[PDB]
Nucleic acid binder design. Structure first.
Lengths: 56, 55
DNA sequence: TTTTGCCATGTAATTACCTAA
DNA sequence: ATTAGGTAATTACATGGCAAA
């Protein structure tokens, strides 16, 4: 899949969600997908990477 | 779906007894020796590990 | 017994998500 | 973003077995 760039609103909402729970459940991912206008896979990958930076 | 031969399952079981986790190399050796693809071996080990957890 | 018919089961393979690189 | 290997949960099959006329 192509490399994308998140808008400031997308990044803000993504950051507030990760603040509550670093893990996404399926329904939750689907919801953030239609609400933000982002492919579920991009949201899934964003959470993986954010968790990886936190550990380091 | 492939069904392993008597001597294959035998070698697989013995290998699994000495080490339940494969290294890329061991996996290659078993492949060329048993005439199986590396994927059939990887999945055999994954499943063996899973079957063991239930008992 | 013989024969016919259904189904429990062991198991290879697939799928989704994870970490770590 | 991609990649490999792991776990856990399913699925799809080849079988052997048991039931019963």
């Amino acid at each position: 899949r192509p490399r994308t760039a998140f808008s400031s609103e997308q990044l803000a909402r993504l950051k507030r969600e990760f603040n509550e729970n670093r893990y996404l459940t399926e329904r939750r991912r689907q919801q953030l997908s239609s609400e933000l206008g982002l492919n579920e896979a991009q949201i899934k990958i964003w959470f993986q990477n954010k968790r990886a930076k936190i550990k380091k």
